[PDB]
Amino acid sequence: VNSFSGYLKLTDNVYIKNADIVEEAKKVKPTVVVNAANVYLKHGGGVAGALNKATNNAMQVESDDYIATNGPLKVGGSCVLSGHNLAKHCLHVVGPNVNKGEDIQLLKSAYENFNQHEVLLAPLLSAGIFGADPIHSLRVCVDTVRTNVYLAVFDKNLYDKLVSSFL
Numbered sequence: 001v002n003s004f005s006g007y008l009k010l011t012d013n014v015y016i017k018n019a020d021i022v023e024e025a026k027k028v029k030p031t032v033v034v035n036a037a038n039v040y041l042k043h044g045g046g047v048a049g050a051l052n053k054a055t056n057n058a059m060q061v062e063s064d065d066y067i068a069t070n071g072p073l074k075v076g077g078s079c080v081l082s083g084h085n086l087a088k089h090c091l092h093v094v095g096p097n098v099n100k101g102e103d104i105q106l107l108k109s110a111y112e113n114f115n116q117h118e119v120l121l122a123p124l125l126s127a128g129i130f131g132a133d134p135i136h137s138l139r140v141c142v143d144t145v146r147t148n149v150y151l152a153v154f155d156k157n158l159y160d161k162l163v164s165s166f167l
């Protein structure tokens with residue numbers, strides 16, 4: 001039993017809710033919140049911008065030190081950093097950004113990072129300002145992630161479409 005509330009069950013291990021991931025993280029304080037990161041960990045907008053703002057920019061400060069030491073992430077890759085006031089840990093995962101021309105096949109590699117964590121609160125990777133079809137992202141999630149994932153979808157209209165079209 002865990003503390004996630006109000007989710008619709010899609011599969012054995014994938015759950016979905018219309019929610020603001022920031023507000024959901026603040027209430028649940030999950031072990032892991034996933035950030036929709038880019039390779040530079042520049043958290044300017046979308047989910048990343050929202051999460052970083054909620055940490056009062058502490059996420060960005062930590063991220064800048066990470067990059068200065070380690071260099072950029074790979075598209076499809078990830079790193080574990082602090083969850084600050086939102087979670088124990090933040091798993092920064094880089095899905096391909098279609099608006100930069102990155103290969104959508106890398107979306108499966110991106111979701112594979114979730115399998116290193118037993119339970120996660122997450123957005124749909126490569127959705128929103130990353131330009132991919134969220135219906136496709138949900139399908140890849142369900143077909144790739146085997147650990148327990150709680151998906152937060154900000155947009156109510158999109159949430160309803162994802163549920164109604166789910167096979």
Ligand SMILES: Cc1nnc(CNc2nc(Cl)cnc2N)n1C1CC1
Pocket residue numbers: 019020021022046047048050122123124127128129151152153154155158
């Ligand atoms: C549309 C849409 N609906 N949900 C998402 C991603 N998930 C979340 N993003 C935020 Cl900013 C807050 N809370 C979330 N759960 N998107 C993408 C970024 C454009």
